[PDB]
Amino acid sequence: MATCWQALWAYRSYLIVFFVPILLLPLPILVPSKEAYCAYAIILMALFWCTEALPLAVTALFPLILFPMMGIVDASEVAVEYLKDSNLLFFGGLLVAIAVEHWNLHKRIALRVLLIVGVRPAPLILGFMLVTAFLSMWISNTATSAMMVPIAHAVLDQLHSSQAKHLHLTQCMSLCVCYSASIGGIATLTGTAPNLVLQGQINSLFPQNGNVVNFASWFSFAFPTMVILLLLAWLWLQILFLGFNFRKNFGIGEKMQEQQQAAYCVIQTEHRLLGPMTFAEKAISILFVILVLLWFTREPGFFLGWGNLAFPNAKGESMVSDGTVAIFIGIIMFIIPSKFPGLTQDPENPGKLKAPLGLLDWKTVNQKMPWNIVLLLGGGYALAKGSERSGLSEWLGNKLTPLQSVPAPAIAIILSLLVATFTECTSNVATTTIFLPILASMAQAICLHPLYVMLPCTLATSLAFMLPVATPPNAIVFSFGDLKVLDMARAGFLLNIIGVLVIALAINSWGIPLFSLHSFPSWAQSNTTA
Amino acid sequence: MATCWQALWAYRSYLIVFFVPILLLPLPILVPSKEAYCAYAIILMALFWCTEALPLAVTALFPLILFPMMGIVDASEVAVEYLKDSNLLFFGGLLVAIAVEHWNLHKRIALRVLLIVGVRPAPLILGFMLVTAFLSMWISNTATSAMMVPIAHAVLDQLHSSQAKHLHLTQCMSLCVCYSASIGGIATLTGTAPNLVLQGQINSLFPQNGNVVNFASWFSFAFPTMVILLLLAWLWLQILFLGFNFRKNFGIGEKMQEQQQAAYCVIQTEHRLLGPMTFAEKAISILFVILVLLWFTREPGFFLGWGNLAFPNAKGESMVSDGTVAIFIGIIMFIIPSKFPGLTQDPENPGKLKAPLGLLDWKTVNQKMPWNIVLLLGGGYALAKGSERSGLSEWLGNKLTPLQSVPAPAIAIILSLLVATFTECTSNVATTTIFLPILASMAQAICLHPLYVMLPCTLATSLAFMLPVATPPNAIVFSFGDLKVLDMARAGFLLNIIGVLVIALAINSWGIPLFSLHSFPSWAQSNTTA
Numbered sequence A, B: 001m002a003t004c005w006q007a008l009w010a011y012r013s014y015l016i017v018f019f020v021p022i023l024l025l026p027l028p029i030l031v032p033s034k035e036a037y038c039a040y041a042i043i044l045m046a047l048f049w050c051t052e053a054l055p056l057a058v059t060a061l062f063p064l065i066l067f068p069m070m071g072i073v074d075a076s077e078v079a080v081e082y083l084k085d086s087n088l089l090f091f092g093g094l095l096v097a098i099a100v101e102h103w104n105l106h107k108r109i110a111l112r113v114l115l116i117v118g119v120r121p122a123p124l125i126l127g128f129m130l131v132t133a134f135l136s137m138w139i140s141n142t143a144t145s146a147m148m149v150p151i152a153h154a155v156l157d158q159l160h161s162s163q164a165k166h167l168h169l170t171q172c173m174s175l176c177v178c179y180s181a182s183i184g185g186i187a188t189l190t191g192t193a194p195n196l197v198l199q200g201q202i203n204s205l206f207p208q209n210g211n212v213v214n215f216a217s218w219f220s221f222a223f224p225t226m227v228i229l230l231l232l233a234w235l236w237l238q239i240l241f242l243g244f245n246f247r248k249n250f251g252i253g254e255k256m257q258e259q260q261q262a263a264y265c266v267i268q269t270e271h272r273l274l275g276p277m278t279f280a281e282k283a284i285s286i287l288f289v290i291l292v293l294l295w296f297t298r299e300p301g302f303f304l305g306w307g308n309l310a311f312p313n314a315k316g317e318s319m320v321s322d323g324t325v326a327i328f329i330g331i332i333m334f335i336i337p338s339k340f341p342g343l344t345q346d347p348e349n350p351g352k353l354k355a356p357l358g359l360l361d362w363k364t365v366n367q368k369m370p371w372n373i374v375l376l377l378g379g380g381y382a383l384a385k386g387s388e389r390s391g392l393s394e395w396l397g398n399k400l401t402p403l404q405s406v407p408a409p410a411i412a413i414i415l416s417l418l419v420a421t422f423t424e425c426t427s428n429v430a431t432t433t434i435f436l437p438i439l440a441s442m443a444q445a446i447c448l449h450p451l452y453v454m455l456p457c458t459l460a461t462s463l464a465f466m467l468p469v470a471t472p473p474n475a476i477v478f479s480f481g482d483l484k485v486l487d488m489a490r491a492g493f494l495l496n497i498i499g500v501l502v503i504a505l506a507i508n509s510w511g512i513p514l515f516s517l518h519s520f521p522s523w524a525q526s527n528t529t530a
């Protein structure tokens, strides 16, 4: 009878976990190679994340058993890949956010934000996108996400509670903060790390170049690209999760103004009934401002920060990172009392006073920390390390070489598509470092100017929108549990193509004059050209 | 008035955190050196752990801010020290223990253990010590602790609930399991990792030695040492936490037999009212047996395991570790259903069936995992790495050289005291690797036989009993929150001296005949001797 078909549909995750590793076994069986053994693991983890047949942190533990059991890397070497400085930065940022939420400062910030920008979905999403992109121009993307994801969560909670469809707004705001942190970092030379890697490669492979890639020329090239890509991402996320209406999205017309003025006066009254700030709110607000100001001035690149003055290494770089500052502020939050004269009496011995708790105690942290996101970030780093140790990146980099029998405006588009597809599985810095010296020689072989193929390769590494392991902002937005990986993939599949087309617009207009991409200059000559 | 003296005593942890870093500042100020900068951090973390002015995982985060801020190591290099394979082994073992506790198998195991060995404190502690030492002779110490600490916790909970002073029994059982895992590993050549390091050094520094250190001679030397040290540790932990009575400790005499027979019949009835095993209990019991059998036969050393047959490296060693097996079994626990035909109906849509949950879901794991012990183990590894990168181990190793103007039975005692003191701060393998080639040349300089100074150095690295970062068993016993670090230090300070005296007994009787430690053989000759 038909009662077996519901039993087969209820058990669908067990069937996925049993049948997906069997159906992909022809790839390691028919092609015995470490590149195929790593491609099997990448396809398996992507299929287990998009279907969510297992929890996210459980799928993130799969390199630890997969890579030693096919000879890619040792268990000792895959074990120290799961906790880097970018993961400690997330730990310290969320350690500050837990103290913000515990002492009701998140309600103050959310009510003041909703009092300033109002209650309209698309202008509020646009304001969050613009602020996240401007912050990501100057600090790290991970620091921007770890600062901005709980603020958007609190604003969204207060917006829900003032109106008593919201489950699409909670996806649109999370994905817009996630994508704005990645988009805004490409506009400056110090915004994302591969932007510096390109300058290191241009200085090493081509001396006598005369500092062709600096702060001013990179800004003049990559700021309109960032603005156009951010506005198109706003329009696409507004179309996909909200409607095609554009008057309901902007709150235009009556039967919409009435509910919006009612929600605005409800927000006004519940903000008025908060009172003065307590001692803990003032202390946490001062520490938050100090943390963001220390993140700004640590290593700016266009002037000399406190990380270069105090604590330099032999190369002059800072030995202290952003995660060090985050862990420092989070440790200080355990030491400052929550009330200063707060000497109470304990339920034990009746001759004792009692010191207050700190701004953080350990049991609040243990109840509130997303440890699955720590494990997800670590599993992403381990999969990215296994892709370099197996030889996938060297194999796919050497497939870009026979593209020489293609006209030059199409080489950049095909290369940008390939790099934007491959950067979902790997690291941005490693992909840039491996892929740039191949493209430099490929451009020297056909007498094409470098940075016609090196600038789209550097920009396409940042177009990482589909998988949780593509960028650390892609994993940080799963901290509250309302998102699915299928929503992120469905939103990012078109954003990759839109970003590739925006890079192709930027390299063929206003990138040709300010870089002289039609001349093949004399600093790119060698013994193989002529 | 006198009401200020209670306000000063209530605020004692804040005063410790403020005044201890200021009072130790003459050590980095008067002695500017990286060895002093690391000694400052070690003394500060030991003082913050023994007083517990901060939580344990918060004090374990101190290398991340300390080592880049005095130039010892970079933030990127100290960040990848916090999650090794021994930490993933604890994660996988406790991931199995959470599933044992969630499905009431821990009550079955605890009631059957209390039905077999009875209810008497000192014989039960001795049985746990003997089983933990015998298990630690053949598998890793971390695997033995991660298997045996929750079992002792469950037995202790059932023993408390059958008798309705226990707060001293819960310290004695935790510390006895912790110390038995460390003591039992010295008896075999494959029990602890420095035991193999010594054999590598004897083979590398002195060829033509004729395999003087093998399985049989190491067993014949180190098994009575282990037995004597285990019995003396049992007697000392019985004296320290229990009384000097030895008849109340063994339950001898009436007014003690009555309560013990009452507790035994209460245990009999509440074990009889459990019923047959469910599906989840049978599945978890089979997986537990399979996990311990895979831990036994992976890399035994005296025969060829499945880790050497399948998955070898170029040197023939196993690429798969014990943590890989633990993570493998813990991942399988998410896939097996808790009931097989358990198709229920969901509170949502009334046309759906519902698959059961697994033996593990993520929310039970998040509620039950001790993440502070993961951070504590990682902070210990980072402090141990900073001690090698700063140069403390090379500095303290070169202080063993001017001990040549001491008679030879006292050189071994002074060296064992120094190594047993220094191994509380550092790693056992690194201390052995650094300290053995200095002692070999020091013994060649005075025409003393090696292994008169290399065997006490190898054995004294395992006498690690005072600090949570000395051994991973020292950190695993804080998983349930009943212990203090001051109890561990108070119990281990005398056990270090007892172990040094037992090593001095073993090297001067029955170690002289079976190693010929009175002859200076011909394989230790060089160009500097004669």
Ligand SMILES: CCCCCCCCCCCCCCCCCC(=O)OC[C@H](COP(=O)(O)O)OC(=O)CCCCCCCCCCCCCCCCC
Residues within 6 Å of the ligand: A108, A109, A112, A113, A116, A117, A127, A128, A131, A134, A135, A151, A285, A288, A289
């Ligand atoms: C160049 C200088 C740095 C510029 C940095 C980028 C620009 C940031 C502008 C953000 C403006 C957001 C609205 C107003 C400020 C935030 C709320 C606030 O001040 O709370 C006061 C609120 C108290 O207000 P009260 O109830 O009136 O006393 O809290 C505090 O005083 C302490 C807050 C410390 C941390 C502030 C974090 C603010 C994050 C805001 C994110 C906004 C995203 C969307 C913005 C759309 C703008 C178009």
Ligand SMILES: CCCCCCCCCCCCCCCCCC(=O)OC[C@H](COP(=O)(O)O)OC(=O)CCCCCCCCCCCCCCCCC
Residues within 6 Å of the ligand: B108, B109, B112, B113, B116, B117, B127, B128, B131, B134, B135, B151, B277, B285, B288, B289
């Ligand atoms: C050489 C072969 C391997 C030897 C390994 C080392 C020796 C281990 C002996 C441990 C004996 C402990 C008492 C009996 C076994 C535990 C309880 C049991 O059988 O549960 C059955 C109990 C069933 O109870 P029932 O159905 O109600 O009869 O559970 C199971 O069947 C599941 C078994 C899973 C694994 C259990 C591991 C228990 C470790 C206990 C450690 C005890 C420490 C103190 C022992 C002092 C001895 C002097």
Ligand SMILES: CC(C)CCC[C@@H](C)[C@H]1CC[C@H]2[C@@H]3CC=C4C[C@@H](OC(=O)CCC(=O)O)CC[C@]4(C)[C@H]3CC[C@]12C
Residues within 6 Å of the ligand: A021, A028, A029, A065, A066, A069, A070, A071, B328, B331, B332
């Ligand atoms: C951990 C739990 C959830 C089960 C996981 C099952 C699969 C996802 C994995 C785990 C072990 C894997 C196997 C481990 C080792 C091999 C040998 C490998 O062939 C070799 O010879 C590998 C070594 C080499 O030749 O270098 C082919 C893939 C295969 C069968 C792997 C196929 C995929 C398997 C079954």
Ligand SMILES: CC(C)CCC[C@@H](C)[C@H]1CC[C@H]2[C@@H]3CC=C4C[C@@H](OC(=O)CCC(=O)O)CC[C@]4(C)[C@H]3CC[C@]12C
Residues within 6 Å of the ligand: A328, A331, A332, B021, B028, B029, B065, B066, B069, B070, B071
């Ligand atoms: C963890 C947070 C909440 C509080 C930490 C306070 C102290 C435990 C630490 C943190 C910063 C440390 C300082 C960081 C750097 C230095 C410089 C150092 O002198 C140097 O010149 C170091 C660099 C070098 O010469 O190689 C002397 C120690 C001192 C003052 C350290 C003393 C101990 C301090 C105050």
Ligand code: NA
Residues within 6 Å of the ligand: A135, A136, A137, A138, A139, A140, A141, A184, A185, A190, A191, A192
């Ligand atoms: Na950035």
Ligand code: NA
Residues within 6 Å of the ligand: A423, A424, A425, A426, A427, A428, A461, A464, A469, A470, A471
């Ligand atoms: Na990437």
Ligand code: NA
Residues within 6 Å of the ligand: B135, B136, B137, B138, B139, B140, B141, B184, B185, B190, B191, B192
């Ligand atoms: Na062992």
Ligand code: NA
Residues within 6 Å of the ligand: B423, B424, B425, B426, B427, B428, B461, B464, B469, B470, B471
């Ligand atoms: Na140690």
